[model samples]
Target chain A: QSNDLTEAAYSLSRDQKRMLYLFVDQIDGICEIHVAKYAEIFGLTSAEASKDIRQALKSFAGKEVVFYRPEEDAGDEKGYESFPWFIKRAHSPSRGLYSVHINPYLIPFFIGLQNRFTQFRLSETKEITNPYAMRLYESLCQYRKPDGSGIVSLKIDWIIERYQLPQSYQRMPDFRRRFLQVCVNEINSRTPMRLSYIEKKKGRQTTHIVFSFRDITS
Target chain B: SNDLTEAAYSLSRDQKRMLYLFVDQIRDGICEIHVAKYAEIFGLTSAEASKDIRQALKSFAGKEVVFYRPEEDAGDEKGYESFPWFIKRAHSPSRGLYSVHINPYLIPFFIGLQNRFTQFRLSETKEITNPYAMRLYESLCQYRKPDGSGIVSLKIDWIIERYQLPQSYQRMPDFRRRFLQVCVNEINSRTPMRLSYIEKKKGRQTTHIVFSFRDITSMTTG
Candidate 1:
């Protein structure tokens, strides 16, 4: 079960997120590729590949993370350091070739050599559209321990903050209708897991949220 | 991910730590370093780390690992492979350390480093003192499906065979009270998971054991 590795979050556009998975799947050294290669890889026209890669790189940098903080205490208490995801991305002047340096911070997520961690496949998310759904799915899946299941309870405010939502949607109904349901709908339809929430109320306001989820295949 | 059911190899706390340190350095499934550097990381004397690394690899050699065979036409298959840890003392005198390569096949157990799998804290198993407790903990954890809880039903014969319990101990009156009870007790006391079992009996004899567990932190883990 690939359940323990934390989500690589960049709040990316759809194409960029797909490219990121493609990058993580690189088995050899640094994932170096040219823009022309995407046409064959993703079955897109050359122009579409170039545009998608370019758009993906838009806001692609600066998402550094310490990654995977469980509800429990500090981890093995070793190798717990933070780093950025993309070190550098360079584009050729004449040709459409682009080269990117994968951050060392992410090396363990790709090639970690220890047990007691979880990771899932990129093929699983091919149909997902909603970014929030993607994130919620990853976080929910992280709660599944190798031995058993765990329920995740998060304050609605904390989720808004963590996912960096628009402040205006901080109002409860807007958050529920636009943000929460979008994730719920996409997850139920596209992914193997199902997610449902219990709202904890204080008088007229919903204060806390608890997400219960499990694998449908199980 | 490959569910390579590894035989439990029990190492002392210190020995486990050294192996982990080596594992951490192998960023892309291969690591090379001198013992002096290994000494610096764990605060060991150079001579101590060198000898320990040598001895560790020596003892690590020859251990076989079995891969779970998924269902095909005839039956689900399982087989053995060389132990994943490969080590070599740097032949040149100047290097004077080791070059270690993680078998590509075994890396998934170490890192299922992708999007969908469940990721937990690596430290959960660190404090477990009993090897059986450790194995039981992981098995229970793995038994947990993506949703949160999973029940494992093992026949008495399967438990004995899988865990490699001494055959001589089969004379004991109650295998459940003897072996399974201790594991459940230790897990409950020392770890974050709560474990318990119910017997699936055929007539008066306890033929199968069904164990259930949950991450203790989950509200429903009970």
Candidate 2:
């Protein structure tokens, strides 16, 4: 049986999963797929499928929820390359990736830190792979709480406006641990095992940090 | 084989004349069947099937109807798509109008104006335009065959209330005619439109219904 709820949860199709996997597998930072792939999934040629999907998904503009509308000016707009689905959120000046299946609002630290509000302009919507995020996990995963408190900590760039206040984020709900766990496991399973995050500073969100790690490949 | 022509040849002149009065749709039905298939399917052909469809429609007059499902969708869904006819109970007050199955090509003309606005409405999330819907309705109203004679004779009806005609429309036939005329002109009119004593349905409380094509004026335009 098809799970409509599951579709709601990720908003990504099984085919899209495969496609995203392929994208990250290739080391390209950006990808431009011929419009036909979407058509094939819907059993129409690129033009027809795109047209129908364009109409169906039209409601997602400036929508406050986790899922927002794709931007289109109807037929008035002549291009498809600039369609809304291809946009990504910038976690911070230093953060490099965005996930389509995962809404930025739903992610724990990103939402809790209120990183989203200040770091508004996101990377364009482009495909990334499980392996790449895993690599990010590998690089960022070492700091467990000093007393072995279940909470894990890693450094993030200090350019962020507010991180010290626990009140704003302590109240944020935590379903993203599931994803963070996925992030943890996915990265540890690959190449070198080292966990790190953007080094923190009191006032600099743009500073990039370097983390040293043990080689998992060895 | 029931060879009627030969038997009729043997009949006397008066007998044949009498036979004509009794002869009805059944012999007409016999004339309609084609011995050989023409085009691969409905779209490519100008054949007996199209003729039969038109003939069958003429029999229904003064009946109320609406076109919700086009024939292409019907044939695509049901497979055989014989275009059969059946009579249903007249529930709408606009029983004066009727709907008939027609060529899919008529769809663009029937609602082409709406097609453009639909895209706009879909994106902006604005309300659908009334003129476009009525232009489609009016286009459907005047449809007919090449020779200026065809069975498809009907009109599209828009009811203000979803249920029935509204209170203001309860008795006034003049108001209804003028209202539709305004809608027609708005849909498309090169000349200045005229409005008489008309009470437009107020408050987002009106229904728009369309009568499919019926006469030669529409067919010639096609």
Candidate 3:
């Protein structure tokens, strides 16, 4: 599930994702979130935070963690599975409290783990504005060693498929400038991890992207 | 200090092998080595060991390890420092004994509780015959953490300069096919490390190589 979570495509806005991370940070079995804490973390006014929470809840109602099944696990059909993040949710406007019931199928991904979990301090990623940077950070964290350094080699096609990039990103230069470069810069500037990447080529066409990173937090 | 681990020297296979043996011996706090013991360890005759040890000592004394030492005003400066691998050498031809002293300055590189050092078992490299393979193995070992895995990303030009490759190896295809591939194959087959590498490009030119490795010795022993 840790692997699946890293590779899963989330179609959420920046705030929506941050809100979800806050929920994850508070989750034991069920996540109990306070609006005041959310507002304090995100630097949002109470009214603004409440509105975003309502919107995020509506989005979460239909949101699914979409990831591809391993080739061996799939038959002849297209091998993709989608699971909701939450099975039930409640908000008490008077108390300014929110309660979320995580899906049983997704419990192992969030709650308990023996090994193979990607972890990062929520504060480290708070300032990341680009959604892709957040996702890439999570992906990079999956490979992180105890000493805070990590490396991952990803095929260009695999990145496109995993992140569900638009058709415009099919062009190398555009994909690099708009997606890869921007996301790397954002992650480096905003997060504790200092990320760098190099492009590997097969003759003329760039085929793979190798990312090397280290957590610079002291 | 870190650069000392990746420092390259031109040594013949026998010389390199003897140097490794010296390193192994010094790690145990033994510096005064007998030629007979070295001969027995290498499975060589006393006469052959005597000849090889002397030759290795001569070459090693002449060799230097270069690393960047940053000066406050000058920025990063390349320092070329030379020291004798053995401080003293004594020979008793009739007894078939040669006594050698390990240089104290060179102790940290081979034998110490230092963070930056190249360490590998002599047995793991016993079958490796290529000098380039042995050198590369030591370089990779320097980067390896306690987990026994490491990633080394080096520029193509830097690798060439560091290893002191010939002019012919300046060509990427030839270098990859003849030098890197050959050494990797030998190392994988004969040593405890399992290595895989990928080439990183700057536009159309292949500029860097990223090598990732895992030492299988730990896995098997654990």
Candidate 4:
């Protein structure tokens, strides 16, 4: 067997740490948004996108960085790496093949970040022609606590329409870099995420914060 | 500060009962992988891994392993353990999360049994290293072997499937999915099957094969 693939690791940055806290601590839940679309919505340059995400992680230390994105994480299961990619507060569902998980401690911070980046209306738009293909992201999936108190959602399609990128960064790294900037800014703003466990449990129980970043497709 | 949570769990007598409840709650299920990994990780090296797995399930048989009918009581045959491996069977769509499974229900039978029982296997396969680890940030990495083959894809489900699969006629803990190696083999096995799998239902098992149209198109003169 080849020993090419690296072992997994966790990372974070300052503001990004705060952002991670928001996802893991403040918010009640989350929603999916397309990566390409989210990138365009933020309207970042390629280098800026990469740099911003790097900075975001630097700013949000202690959270994890998972490297699985569309086209980037191809041939990978579900086009996404499982682990750290699936974020929950402290405990994850040991239910079965799949389970619903929600942690309450992260709602406030995430909602605040999201309010900043998702200023563009999240409408259902299509990206049939763009080089940067669209992917289903957490932004599209809505999150809310059991009490229906801390609700978070994303307008993913709204982000996909801008800067018609190529289907994959492989075919178009430049577009992906710019698209990544959008992703970082959008994700950073949505930081310190808190999650919603709709399928199971009771009340907006606060959970230990957890920061999970996408596994690199590279 | 960060601390490591336990990746390993040992099922106590009561915990085994809890696992059974979850299996039934989800309907269809396999109660394996955990037995195997648990046995190894917990230093129970007395018997083979297979024996340990079965021993663990003997307490939860039928409902989890072999069925024992008191009316049909026997010394041992009456409570024959039907399943070979122990793993979480995917009964519900959302079942099996954070659990181990075997689903030995997929074995191809006597032939597969012969292969599995008589096979000489290693305790573990070699690990893949990341020479290009740093580049993963730049978005790149390489997993080539000394034999010229390299990493194509590392499907998590695919690897998990292999872990529980008994030794088949052919055993590949991890496949490189090499293109040329496969092409040469197809020509050798006149009875070529690009796809083959073992299926189980109730008490019957079957094996099916599919030829590669891609091969036929390239070789056939007609």
Candidate 5:
């Protein structure tokens, strides 16, 4: 379970994202992932899984989760809090063991969540090969209403900022063709999400994106 | 932001004062202190201050803070790391100067803290005679509400774990009479805070203590 509106904004590769999701799914106080189990889950060879795990740990050490706080007043300091996902990581090569000690402060966001949280089967995300698709899919799931349909209007800049999209995606045509359209297509094809979006224009510029979606399995 | 509140190590009154003095002088991860000034602050002779400083440094060198995360099923398997308070200590006898270098890893907890911090004057704690009373005073200060009142509910086990109490203090009556009551008496009388507490029990076992407190200023103003 992930907190819907309290999304952790970070940029990571598909494999790294999957690794994190898996860690969250199995997290107690500390989480351990065996290389053989990881290989079986992702259909990778033991060697490939080992390399990926090592790379993921390295990347995760430097990554932080930024959560936007509610805006209360004008001219306030940045309404956001950021923290690392894990405090410590350890690996045992001979035993093929990799473990992560999650930052204790973040335990509530992942465990024992009651309401306004997104709950999806881990298998649904297995085939989401594109990192952007995974991010958009989670974002869409967050806004899902009780009637099996959801409509969310997000600023183009907000999407870029939340997903940490490269500066090249700032251009509308390039953003639509290379990032937005590609992600939408991937989400619809690879997952159970039925997603479509329309561009909102402010005069000649597309500034906001409205996404209407439904979960087919719901 | 002072480190005394959540610090794991226990110090005597003068040692704590020395540490506080060093913390006050910290600049860019380092603190330099003169023996004469240290003696003046505590109203001690130079020789006594020098001896106390050495003892404090020794205690600090041996102290460490541990962060532990246990494995789900394996009792023996766990992840933990410990860090000492200071990495280097430099003393110049001719100049009567002492320089202490804080651990780089622990700097964020002390220096340039941005949010979720507690601030209190050293004067308030100087008269506190009991170390546990001082620790409790600092801890309670963290929960002070905007109206100058604070309520904290702490488990008995957590208190023991946090303060590294001896096993004999595990007995409920002894813990209350020897530890909690003493601390409360010292804090209420010495500091500017008024304190009271009640114990919560589950199945005849005292499990937690709920403390209610208000600053003296709040009482006067209201």
Candidate 6:
């Protein structure tokens, strides 16, 4: 699905991204494709292309490729399973071919409402070294509003949990030093976006990490 | 993560290899050290230890690790230079030994950077094959939560600057076709993290980019 590849492609490398786009270009469901065929498309020697793609192919392993399906969408009404799936790429050694099993969850990319989608370039991420910085960059970009200001309301706990960081990072200084500050430093330097944060505290401790950012062009 | 520990250091191969002994004996906050003592500790001649410590110490200079305005300046001044108080070493034979002053910023390692700063393994990063991958790893590590959900979105201009690529790769398909894809693939397969991305557009023009990733503790397939 288009949505499936787009979501998983965020952290994918340049070649890996291409590999994915190539695979998704022709089919929507399960299928096996020849490596040399892929090589021909890229204008590389079959062996070279195959080698590059084979190495590039591993970038998708265990990467989280999922989308949200809130309860409202569940007309059937149940313990709605949040759709999450991992990309599976396998090599048929005997066949000397590589085939990708589009995660069934990725069906939405191909089947969902096509009008409600956006596409970005791999270049924007060229200067960025930290993936979290890149993630926050998108969250802020998606936050763009009509007034030309983009805002993201987020939780420190959620970030810490998502990154699998220590509980001690709940402290403002600790979290700021290792995570927020790191993200801010990278974002300010690498993107058209500039960022600053507002700490919401219930008492002496910060409970929310509210971010306000705007693309300089705006 | 890797970057934090990495953020704290910039050692050459020799300095790092020798640091195994030098670092173990040092204490937190303003520990006094000298080259001669280092020689005794590592079982090397004073000249060898001095050369190594001296070289490693230089990395701390002007490395903006912290920020501070002198307390005496309770005055109306605003921003100031970052306080990079890592290592302060000097060679002086006046009364004798070449010495060093280890700062508070480095105290964390002696105390809890390992137990606290998840993804810190000085041993691992100490001798990695691709240093750039380590940088990319830290960048990705900053994105996800305990559940492993986060995306790294960026613009081409920014990435070009942050990395050593051409700044005018703006409309050049060559950049992606050549270097960009090559890099991401390396990081994904060689390290503990997995990476992917989706390019975004503005008014039918491809203008921005972003990424997504997660950790895979499984051993490398090599």
- The estimated TM-scores of all candidates read 0.30, 0.21, 0.33, 0.20, 0.36, 0.32
Tell me the tens digit of each residue's lDDT in model 4 across B28-146: 43333443344444455524543444344332222222222333332322211122223221111122222333333322221322221112110111111221111110111123223
The residue-level lDDT of candidate 2 at B131 comes to 33
Question: Model 2 segments beyond 4 Å from truth?
Answer: A1-13, A21-83, A86-167, A171-218, B1-222
The runs of at least 3 residues in candidate 3 whose Cα sits more than 4 Å from the true structure, single-residue gaps closed, are A9-14, A25-28, A37-44, A70-79, A112-118, A126-191, A197-218, B1-222
lDDT by residue for model 3 (B1-222), tens: 244443322334455566666655654333544667778877989878867876654444333333333331121222122333343333343333444555455567664312222356543343444556767777787788889898999888887876778889999899988789998887777677888899999899999888998887766642
Model 4 reproduced share of reference interface contacts = 0.00
lDDT of 6 at B160: 60
Best by lDDT: 5
User: How good is model 1 by TM-score?
Assistant: 0.30
Point out the worst 10-residue segment of candidate 2 chain B by lDDT.
B80-89
* Model 2 TM-score relative to the real fold: 0.21
lDDT comparison, 2 vs 4, better candidate: 2
Q: Candidate 1: which docking quality band? A: incorrect
Give candidate 1 misplaced runs (Cα > 4 Å): A1-5, A27-29, A62-82, A93-95, A112-119, A122-186, A189-192, A196-218, B1-222
Separate clash counts for every candidate: 26, 26, 0, 93, 0, 57
Residue A177 lDDT in candidate 2: 38
Q: What does DockQ come to for candidate 6?
A: 0.01
lDDT of 1 by residue, A47-79 (tens): 678667756654464333343323322323212
Q: Interface RMSD (Å) of model 6?
A: 30.0
Kindly list the per-residue Cα lDDT of model 3 for residues A104-213, writing each as its tens digit. Answer: 55676655321212355553343444566666777788798888798899988888787767789989989989999998998787677889898999899999888999
Q: In candidate 2, what are the lDDT values of residues A1-218, reduced to their tens digit?
A: 11111112123333443343333333213333333665665577645543443333222212112221124212322111101222221111011111222221123222322221122101111222343243343223333233321223343322112222223323213312333345445444432344433333457332333443443333
Worst 10 residues of 1 chain B by lDDT: B72-81
For all candidates in order, the CA lDDT equals: 0.55, 0.29, 0.63, 0.27, 0.64, 0.52
**Candidate 5 residue-wise lDDT, B18-89, digit = tens:** 665655555356666567878887688988887777556544443433444354223333444444555444
TM-scores of chain A across candidates: 0.50, 0.23, 0.56, 0.20, 0.55, 0.50
